[PDB]
Structure formats: structure tokens, C-alpha cells
UniProtKB/Swiss-Prot annotation:
This is E3 ubiquitin-protein ligase TRIM21. The keyword Lyase does not apply. Its main location: cytoplasm. The gene is Trim21. It is found in: Cytoplasm; Cytoplasmic vesicle, Autophagosome; Nucleus; Cytoplasm, P-body.
Length: 185
């Protein structure tokens, strides 16, 4: 693809993080802690899942960023409405304000309702995410496989400002401790 020139510098918003997440000083990496991270609760924090938002809000234009997923067993990535539900149980779907893909149990799926099987021959170590606000498009690219397309959500109805969305996943197995990292431009 040729979206690299719309690169944006994303940083994580501490205040939105689940209370078990550890965000690096530079706000560019996040991982699951082995306990509560000694923060106060607030209405912004994702309560049920190890999720966090980017600080940046997008309401126009074209935006591109990359995320490192090396050696993780489980994760969710994409964008969401600024006003998504934070508390309790919910599914990742466009009806709920999310445009996401994930890894779970050795398969990759797009967060449609119901979910869509992805066809990935080369397991990605870095994922590229492209958003065209006006066109209503969110696309995912396999940076490890020369930028090959993973999935395109089209005819998106954003219905609000968008925020970068992350889920580091649980670490029940002891094999999913590795961080998500925002990769340099
Ligand atoms: N039933 C709804 O009201 N939906 C919310 C908006 N939708 C989308 O943004 C979308 C993009 C790709 C697939 O769905 C469709 C689902």
C-alpha cells in the first residue's frame, strides 16, 4: 500500500486504561500487569477487559499508524467511537462503535457481527491501520508480509470522533505477557 505518508504519532491515554495495564513513560507501549496498578477508578476506564484508547481524536482526514504484536497469543486492534461503553460486558462490533481485528486461539478474525474469518499465511509481527474518515474506511495491513491487505471495513458509519483502540488480552496461559508497541514513523 501507499498510506505511509498519512502517518500520525499515536500516544496512549492512561486515564482510559484498565487498572491492570502498565503504560510506558513515553506512552507508546502497554502490557498486562500481574496485579492492580494502584490507580484510582474513573468513568473512562475499561473495567472488564485489558483495553486502552489512544489520546488522539480524529473527525476528518486520512490517518495511518503501526502496532507491534510480536510473540502475543491474543490481542484486539483498530479504532472506536469516543463514546463506546467502558463498563461491563460487550462485543466488538460496528453496531457498538468498534472497527477492529483480533488474534485468538491461533486464528485471526474481523470484529463484524458475526465475526469474519481472516486469511493470513504469514503471522504478522506488525499491523498497519489506515482510517479514511470521509470515505468511511478502516483497513488493516500485514507489515511482516510486504504490507499485504488483511481486511477492509467499508461503508463505515463512525457517528462521532474516532480514537485508536487497543486490547493487550488476558494472560491466563503465561504466554501472552508481551506488550503492544506503537512503532516509529
Ligand atoms: N447495524 C448498525 O447500525 N451498524 C453500525 C454501523 N455499521 C458499520 O459502521 C459498518 C462498517 C462495516 C460494517 O458495518 C454497520 C452496523
Amino acid at each position: 500500500h501507499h498510506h505511509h505518508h498519512h502517518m500520525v504519532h499515536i500516544t496512549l491515554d492512561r486515564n482510559t486504561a484498565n487498572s491492570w495495564l502498565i503504560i510506558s513513560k513515553d506512552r507508546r507501549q502497554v502490557r498486562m500487569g500481574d496485579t492492580h496498578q494502584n490507580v484510582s477508578d474513573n468513568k473512562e476506564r475499561f473495567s472488564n477487559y485489558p483495553m486502552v484508547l489512544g489520546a488522539q481524536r480524529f473527525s476528518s482526514g486520512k490517518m495511518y499508524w503501526e502496532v507491534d504484536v510480536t510473540q502475543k497469543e491474543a490481542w484486539d486492534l483498530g479504532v472506536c467511537r469516543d463514546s463506546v461503553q467502558r463498563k461491563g460486558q460487550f462485543s466488538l462490533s460496528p453496531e457498538n462503535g468498534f472497527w477492529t481485528i483480533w488474534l485468538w486461539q491461533d486464528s485471526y478474525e474481523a470484529g463484524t457481527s458475526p465475526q469474519t474469518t481472516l486469511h493470513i499465511q504469514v503471522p504478522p509481527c506488525q499491523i498497519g491501520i489506515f482510517v479514511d474518515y470521509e470515505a468511511g474506511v478502516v483497513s488493516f495491513y500485514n507489515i511482516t508480509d510486504h504490507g499485504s491487505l488483511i481486511y477492509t471495513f467499508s461503508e463505515c458509519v463512525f457517528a462521532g470522533p474516532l480514537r485508536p483502540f487497543f486490547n493487550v488480552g488476558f494472560n491466563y496461559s503465561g504466554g501472552n505477557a508481551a506488550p503492544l508497541k506503537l512503532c516509529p514513523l
